[PDB]
């Protein structure tokens, strides 16, 4: 009968235009990737929030986290923005001053 194992496709590029503060977020994602724990990427803008629980992921997975954050700052573009990274209880809030 058989079964084809998980396929791997290559995202050749990243969002390098907005990706400035986003790469700064990937520094923390790739840093925490050493343990690869429950990394919860939480994005509060105005009155909408977006919570992403990623537990034991790859470097190609976590690039999507900031690549989702770009979409939030595109649609809103508001000063009321909070990116909030959790990892085993440890919290960091990046706000546009």
Plain-language structure description:
This protein has two helices and four strands, in the order αββαββ. It has one domain (about 10-95). Strands 2-1-3-4 form a four-stranded antiparallel sheet, with helices on one face. Helices cover about 30% and strands about 30% of the residues.
Write the layout of secondary structure elements.
Elements: H1 21-32, E1 38-45, E2 48-55, H2 59-75, E3 81-87, E4 90-95
Helix pairs in contact: 1-2
Strand content: 25-35%
What strand order characterises the main sheet? 2-1-3-4
Number of domains: 1
| Helix and strand pattern | HEEHEE
In total, how many beta strands?
A: 4
In which range does the helix fraction lie?
25-40%
Q: Helical segment tally?
A: 2
What is Rg?
15 Å
Distance between the termini: 58 Å
Largest sheet: 4 strands, antiparallel
PDB class: de novo protein
Keywords: de no designed foldit foldit3, DE novo protein
Assembly: monomeric
Entry title: De novo Designed Protein Foldit3
Summary, kept brief:
With 97 residues, this protein is of the alpha+beta class. It has helices spanning 21-32, 59-75, and strands at residues 38-45, 48-55, 81-87, 90-95.
Which descriptors would you attach to this protein?
monomer, 97 residues, alpha+beta, four-stranded antiparallel beta sheet, globular, de novo protein, de no designed foldit foldit3
């Amino acid at each position: 009968m058989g079964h084809h194992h998980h396929h791997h496709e290559n995202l050749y590029f990243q969002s390098h235009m907005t990706d400035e503060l986003l790469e700064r977020l990937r520094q923390l994602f790739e840093e925490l990737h050493e343990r690869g724990t429950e990394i919860v990427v939480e994005v509060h803008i105005n009155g909408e929030r977006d919570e992403i629980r990623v537990r034991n992921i790859s470097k190609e997975e976590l690039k999507k986290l900031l690549e989702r954050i770009r979409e939030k700052i595109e649609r809103e573009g508001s000063s009321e923005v909070e990116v909030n990274v959790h990892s085993g209880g440890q919290t960091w809030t990046f706000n546009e001053k």
